[PDB]
Amino acid sequence: MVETEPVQGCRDFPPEAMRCRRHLFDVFHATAKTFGFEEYDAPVLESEELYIRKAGEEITEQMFNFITKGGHRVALRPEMTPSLARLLLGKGRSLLLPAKWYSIPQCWRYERRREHYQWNMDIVGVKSVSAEVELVCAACWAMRSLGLSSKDVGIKVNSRKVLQTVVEQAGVTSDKFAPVCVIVDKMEEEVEAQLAVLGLEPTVVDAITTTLSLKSIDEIAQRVGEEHEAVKELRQFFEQVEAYGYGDWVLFDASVVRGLAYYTGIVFEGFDREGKFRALCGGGRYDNLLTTYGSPTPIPCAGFGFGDCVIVELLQEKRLLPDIPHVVDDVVIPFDESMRPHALAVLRRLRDAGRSADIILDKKKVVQAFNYADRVGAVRAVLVAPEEWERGEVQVKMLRRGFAVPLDRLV
Amino acid sequence: MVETEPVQGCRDFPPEAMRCRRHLFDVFHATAKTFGFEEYDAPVLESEELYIRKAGEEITEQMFNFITKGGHRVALRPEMTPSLARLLLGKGRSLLLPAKWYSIPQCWRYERRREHYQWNMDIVGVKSVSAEVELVCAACWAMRSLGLSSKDVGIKVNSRKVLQTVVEQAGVTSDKFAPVCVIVDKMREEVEAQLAVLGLEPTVVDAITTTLSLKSIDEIAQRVGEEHEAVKELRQFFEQVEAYGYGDWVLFDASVVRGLAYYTGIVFEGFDREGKFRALCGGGRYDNLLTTYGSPTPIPCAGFGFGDCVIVELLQEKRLLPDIPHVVDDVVIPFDESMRPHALAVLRRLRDAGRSADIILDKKKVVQAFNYADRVGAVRAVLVAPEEWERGEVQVKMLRRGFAVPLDRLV
Ligand SMILES: N[C@@H](Cc1c[nH]c[nH+]1)C(=O)O
Ligand SMILES: N[C@@H](Cc1c[nH]c[nH+]1)C(=O)O
Ligand SMILES: OCc1ccc(Cl)cc1
Ligand SMILES: OCc1ccc(Cl)cc1
Numbered sequence: 001m002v003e004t005e006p007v008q009g010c011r012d013f014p015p016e017a018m019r020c021r022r023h024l025f026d027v028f029h030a031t032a033k034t035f036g037f038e039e040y041d042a043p044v045l046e047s048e049e050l051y052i053r054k055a056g057e058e059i060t061e062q063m064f065n066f067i068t069k070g071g072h073r074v075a076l077r078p079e080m081t082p083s084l085a086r087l088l089l090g091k092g093r094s095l096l097l098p099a100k101w102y103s104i105p106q107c108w109r110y111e112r113r114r115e116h117y118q119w120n121m122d123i124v125g126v127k128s129v130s131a132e133v134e135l136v137c138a139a140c141w142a143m144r145s146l147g148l149s150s151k152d153v154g155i156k157v158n159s160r161k162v163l164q165t166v167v168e169q170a171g172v173t174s175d176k177f178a179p180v181c182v183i184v185d186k187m188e189e190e191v192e193a194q195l196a197v198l199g200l201e202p203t204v205v206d207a208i209t210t211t212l213s214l215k216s217i218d219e220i221a222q223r224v225g226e227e228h229e230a231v232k233e234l235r236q237f238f239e240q241v242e243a244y245g246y247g248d249w250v251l252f253d254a255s256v257v258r259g260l261a262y263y264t265g266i267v268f269e270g271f272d273r274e275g276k277f278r279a280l281c282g283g284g285r286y287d288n289l290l291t292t293y294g295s296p297t298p299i300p301c302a303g304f305g306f307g308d309c310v311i312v313e314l315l316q317e318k319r320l321l322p323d324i325p326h327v328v329d330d331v332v333i334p335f336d337e338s339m340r341p342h343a344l345a346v347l348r349r350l351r352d353a354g355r356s357a358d359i360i361l362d363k364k365k366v367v368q369a370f371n372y373a374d375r376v377g378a379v380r381a382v383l384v385a386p387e388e389w390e391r392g393e394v395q396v397k398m399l400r401r402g403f404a405v406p407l408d409r410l411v
Numbered sequence: 412m413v414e415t416e417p418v419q420g421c422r423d424f425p426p427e428a429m430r431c432r433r434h435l436f437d438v439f440h441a442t443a444k445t446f447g448f449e450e451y452d453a454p455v456l457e458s459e460e461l462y463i464r465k466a467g468e469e470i471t472e473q474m475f476n477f478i479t480k481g482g483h484r485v486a487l488r489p490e491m492t493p494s495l496a497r498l499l500l501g502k503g504r505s506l507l508l509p510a511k512w513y514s515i516p517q518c519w520r521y522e523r524r525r526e527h528y529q530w531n532m533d534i535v536g537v538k539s540v541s542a543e544v545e546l547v548c549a550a551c552w553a554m555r556s557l558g559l560s561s562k563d564v565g566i567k568v569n570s571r572k573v574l575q576t577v578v579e580q581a582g583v584t585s586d587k588f589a590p591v592c593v594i595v596d597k598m599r600e601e602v603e604a605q606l607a608v609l610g611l612e613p614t615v616v617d618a619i620t621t622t623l624s625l626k627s628i629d630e631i632a633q634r635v636g637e638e639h640e641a642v643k644e645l646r647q648f649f650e651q652v653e654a655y656g657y658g659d660w661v662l663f664d665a666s667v668v669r670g671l672a673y674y675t676g677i678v679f680e681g682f683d684r685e686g687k688f689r690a691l692c693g694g695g696r697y698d699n700l701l702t703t704y705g706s707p708t709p710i711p712c713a714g715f716g717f718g719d720c721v722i723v724e725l726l727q728e729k730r731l732l733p734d735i736p737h738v739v740d741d742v743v744i745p746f747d748e749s750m751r752p753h754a755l756a757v758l759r760r761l762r763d764a765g766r767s768a769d770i771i772l773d774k775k776k777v778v779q780a781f782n783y784a785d786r787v788g789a790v791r792a793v794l795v796a797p798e799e800w801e802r803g804e805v806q807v808k809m810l811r812r813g814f815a816v817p818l819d820r821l822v
Pocket of ligand 4: 469470473489490520524525526
């Protein structure tokens with residue numbers, strides 16, 4: 001007997017599990033459509049060079065990479081943002097900006113699960129925080145669409161610019177800022193030692209620690225000034241979300257930095273308000289990424305990733321993932337095999353009218369056919385019997401007793 | 412500058428190209444739903460052992476395989492049928508039969524393109540040709556849904572049982588039947604040699620050649636008898652398709668065997684009637700596969716694959732793939748930045764009502780905002796200006812001039 005289990009860390013989706021995934025993905029797609037985002041995709045296999053960012057990121061540390069027969073360094077994508085950036089860079093001047101692009105890629109890792117789907121939403125060519133506002137509202141919109149409330153979840157929001165200033169004021173060369181963010185993200189203090197290793201004195205580490213523990217934007221304003229970009233941008237951000245009607249979903253948290261090297265501005269992450277789960281989604285502004293890829297002009301970008309695993313756990317806890325049973329509109333039942341041709345003509349007509357319909361394919365008796373119809377969630381059984389067929393009719397039975405119906409009146 | 416081209420043999424789908432793929436996939440999904448098939452999925456990464464069939468199949472010869480860090484032989488799936496079989500086998504007794512399962516996996520190869528998407532449709536637990544009938548009708552239904560006619564395309568149909576009988580009558584051990592099919596699929600001089608290599612006398616090769624050139628079912632009946640399984644099954648098959656109303660789409664062709672080891676019964680393939688393209692789709696009955704995987708009871712199966720590349724070429728030729736431009740229902744335009752909060756409230760209301768809507772995110776003048784709206788295919792522009800806002804109104808302009816509308820009446 002062959003191995004029936006999937007490869008280590010990967011999931012099968014038989015139809016029951018696929019209905020759940022589809023429920024989630026319908027929301028991702030519908031939210032993207034509601035927000036005017038365009039779908040794109042790119043190969044799951046990318047060149048390894050795309051992810052060599054040299055900032056000690058967990059995401060690049062745990063890459064599912066391998067070497068092709070021809071000796072080329074490739075990887076199954078750990079994330080989608082680099083692929084997006086590749087595509088944008090390849091279009092160059094021909095791309096109309098602003099652009100709002102989304103996708104739902106499977107992404108990979110090697111170390112637990114080795115595989116997940118991640119809804120990506122990114123806005124390209126918008127300098128102002130209106131982008132982050134829209135992105136955050138999109139994430140909330142998807143969660144609300146799944147039945148969650150602002151009591152259940154929220155989005156923590158911060159700007160990396162506050163920390164940037166603190167690091168710059170201490171004389172720390174700007175090429176250490178990304179590593180500093182990767183490290184400070186690990187506050188989940190073994191962190192104090194890593195910063196020293198990166199090459200920062202205790203007074204600099206102290207100031208970092210203090211700013212991550214500031215509990216309001218006003219306290220940020222006190223320290224760096226109300227004119228500081230981070231303050232103005234965060235204030236605009238909250239004003240706009242408030243205006244859009246999702247004020248209860250969002251809040252300021254000075255300890256949110258994210259683990260990715262490339263965030264330059266606002267960053268955010270979704271969380272359950274019971275403190276039971278890891279982040280539901282995560283994102284930020286990344287204005288220099290395209291420049292590091294060789295773009296001749298800077299290109300503003302912001303976006304988020306929203307995984308398919310934590311959300312499902314949360315929804316299970318909140319009893320928002322009831323079993324969705326399979327459904328089909330009609331099941332056409334030949335009285336016997338001599339009625340199969342007529343039944344096929346009936347089946348054709350039902351499908352032509354936009355109905356989902358089965359025909360009983362195997363040889364079986366009517367009662368068993370009826371049971372089968374019930375099992376597949378048929379709304380209606382259509383019995384094609386010789387007596388009614390002579391009258392230009394079939395027998396119809398609703399499952400959600402027994403009437404004869406003219407062939408033209410079935411739809 | 413990073414490499415902007417995708418990895419060798421793989422495709423990018425920026426939004427323009429994604430709209431085309433989506434148009435196709437909508438049809439696959441909608442056809443599956445119309446025919447009552449259930450969606451499933453499985454990991455793109457499978458164990459190599461799953462595909463070691465030892466029949467010299469092109470599909471197993473060109474596997475994209477590699478070795479994990481831990482030393483496990485894995486592959487990116489060349490096809491989906493083995494994964495399906497794995498899943499079915501893992502469910503075992505708990506799976507209700509009949510089952511009709513579909514998916515649209517990306518499948519891979521190494522050698523030209525290294526990657527394609529393939530609509531898979533399979534029926535499990537049906538012994539009778541009604542399964543093949545439904546599968547073939549499904550393929551036709553998808554093609555007709557895309558705008559093709561029976562003048563444009565058809566499905567060639569055969570049974571491997573005819574050739575089975577010929578091989579058995581020559582004393583050829585049954586373990587050579589699959590290799591024989593793989594070889595005969597490669598068609599005159601060149602194929603004749605491979606059969607000899609496989610270990611078959613010229614008289615046996617002659618008889619094979621003759622049966623592949625028989626031009627009707629009647630000629631098959633003359634050779635192997637009218638009561639031969641293949642003849643009765645093919646006759647039932649055509650009677651049923653005729654009854655379903657797709658008789659013009661299907662025909663008998665004795666040279667169709669397919670290249671896969673596992674087909675035991677009826678086989679078929681879609682083709683353009685101009686003879687310009689490779690096969691549009693391909694499939695058949697494979698009643699022993701689950702038995703070879705270790706199933707304790709035989710499990711009848713039939714299905715097909717329908718790739719995403721040949722169909723698109725054909726549709727391009729027939730001018731059935733017009734550019735589908737992006738569309739959005741509304742574009743909300745703040746008169747200026749002081750109107751952004753009100754505009755956001757308007758945007759919220761539009762989206763709450765199920766409309767797709769943008770808001771102009773960066774700072775720009777109204778006419779440029781209008782142009783942008785036209786560029787993204789907005790049906791309607793909604794100008795949020797201070798004069799109208801005092802009256803509880805906005806200005807609306809249809810893009811396919813200028814009226815004031817109450818906020819509650821926008822939807
Ligand atoms: N790539 C990020 C999410 C993201 C999308 N766009 C910007 N950021 C992550 O995996 O966490
Ligand atoms: N796996 C086959 C198609 C198929 C699906 N189910 C049965 N046959 C192919 O790739 O050609
Ligand atoms: O490294 C990001 C990542 C996280 C989770 C999975 Cl399963 C795959 C990738
Ligand atoms: O032979 C299977 C296969 C065929 C075509 C592509 Cl592109 C990928 C896989």
